[PDB]
Specification:
The structure is a homodimer. Chain A is of the alpha/beta class. Chain A contains three helices and five strands, in the order E-E-H-E-H-E-H-E. Helices cover about 25% and strands about 30% of the residues of chain A. Chains A and B meet through strand 2 and strand 5 of A and strand 2 and strand 5 of B. The PDB classes it as viral protein.
Chain lengths: ~110, ~110
């Protein structure tokens, strides 16, 4: 399964050791990824869901659930370029854009 | 550098593709790790710093800073077993223990 996550987290299923491939990708590559297979959003902030929906051209719901990844899964991760103060949630796509972000693809094996 | 992080985040330096090895470890293995080489804490919640200091027997400061990892670095990650509501910070080691956690070692190459 391809998961879309709102941070660069690697929520691995216990019981196994893993090798993870990681690379940064463009918006267009990310768009192609989420267009050509089923994805599961675990995006947990409204503004992040709104921004990802816009840049990817698909419905990225705000779905604040715990997911675990295991062998064969992939993660599209939205990685904000700064660390936020404790408890702070960025409420606008405008602020997310000014802070800046990277899109990463993690492939779990 | 060995970093101690308060979530299972993989804050990779852009400009390169990576292979990351990941496995769960015991408290004793984690203790040995942080005892035998220099570490840099980026723990960003008081209760998590207090808990890690206790279980590892070393000073794990609360140091809420952005760090990036690259080839040759390792991460000791504290991974809480549940996802928290938006903006919520767990304020007691007692609650962290009841939720439960895993310690993961990520080796970045």
């Amino acid at each position: 399964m391809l998961y879309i996550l709102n941070s660069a987290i690697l929520p691995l299923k216990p019981g196994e050791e893993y090798t993870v491939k990681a690379k940064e990708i463009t918006i267009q590559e990310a768009k192609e990824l989420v267009t050509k297979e089923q994805f599961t959003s675990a995006i947990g902030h409204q503004a992040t869901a709104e921004l990802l929906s816009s840049i990817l051209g698909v419905n990225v719901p705000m779905n604040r659930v715990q997911i675990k990844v295991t062998h064969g899964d992939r993660i599209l991760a939205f990685m904000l370029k700064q660390r936020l103060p404790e408890g702070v949630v960025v409420k606008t796509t405008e602020e997310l854009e000014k802070i800046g972000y990277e899109l990463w693809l993690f492939e779990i094996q």
